[PDB]
Amino acid sequence: ARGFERGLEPEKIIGATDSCGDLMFLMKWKDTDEADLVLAKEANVKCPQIVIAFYEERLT
Amino acid sequence: ARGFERGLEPEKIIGATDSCGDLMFLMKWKDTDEADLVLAKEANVKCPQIVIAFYEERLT
């Protein structure tokens, strides 16, 4: 049971990689310290403001 | 001239600049070649998937 399947609230994306062919985000979930990979596509649609916060922080 | 006030659908963000202290996007609107500066904060809320497509392309 991983990523969104864990049923937790998204908190913060801490990294991204397309190294596997598909863009994936490393998601920090609310009230756990076990982070997981989720598809960018699914995060884009389910928590778009959290995705944007990640990209805006990455701009500087 | 007016940006979102023009009542056009966002097509794509051409680029982004913080050169004014606030993050701004240069927005291409559908069916117009007149691009406009809009606040990132406003695009984030009104057309988040257009913002994300811009950032995803820039990540490559």
Residue numbers in the entry:
A (entry chain A), B (entry chain B): 114 to 173
Wording from the paper:
HP1α contains two folded domains, chromodomain (CD) and chromoshadow domain (CSD), which are linked by a hinge region and flanked by the amino-terminal and carboxyl-terminal extensions (nte and cte). CD binds to tri/di methylated lysine 9 of histone H3 (H3K9me3/2), a major epigenetic modification and a hallmark of heterochromatin, whereas CSD mediates dimerization and associates with various proteins through recognizing the PxVxL motif, also known as the HP1 box. In addition to supporting the establishment of H3K9me3 as a recruitment module for HP1, KAP1 contains a HP1 box (KAP1Hbox) sequence, which is recognized by the CSD of HP1α (HP1αCSD) in biochemical studies. Each HP1αCSD protomer folds into a short N-terminal helix α1, a central three-stranded antiparallel β-sheet, and two C-terminal helices α2 and α3.
To determine whether conformational changes accompany the complex formation, we obtained the crystal structure of the apo-state of HP1αCSD and characterized 15N-labeled full-length HP1α by NMR. In agreement, the crystal structure of HP1αCSD in the apo-state showed that the HP1αCSD dimer is in contact with another HP1αCSD dimer (two dimers form an asymmetric unit). The dimers interacted through their β-sheets (protomers of one HP1αCSD dimer are colored wheat and grey, and both protomers of the second dimer are colored yellow). The β-sheet binding interface was comprised of primarily hydrophobic residues, such as I126, I127, A129, L136, L139, W142, A148, L150 and V151. To determine the role of the β-sheet interface in oligomerization of HP1α, we mutated L139 and L150, identified in molecular dynamics (MD) simulations, to glutamate in HP1αCSD and in FL protein and tested the L139E/L150E mutants by NMR and MP. In contrast to WT FL HP1α, NMR resonances of CSD in the 1H,15N HSQC spectrum of FL L139E/L150E HP1α became detectable, indicating that mutation of the β-sheet interface residues L139 and L150 disrupted the formation of higher order HP1α oligomers. Collectively, these data revealed that while HP1αCSD forms a dimer through α-helices, HP1α oligomerization involves the β-sheet of HP1αCSD. Overlay of the structures of HP1αCSD in the apo-state (yellow) and HP1αCSD (pink) bound to KAP1Hbox’ within the larger crystal lattice showed that while the protomers HP1αCSD1 and HP1αCSD2 of a dimer can be superimposed, the protomers from the neighboring dimers were oriented distinctly differently in the crystal structure. The orientation of one of the neighboring dimers in the apo-state structure was opposite to its orientation in the complex and overall, the neighboring dimers in the apo state structure were not superimposable (Fig. 6a–c, only one protomer from the neighboring dimers is shown in (a) and (b) for clarity).
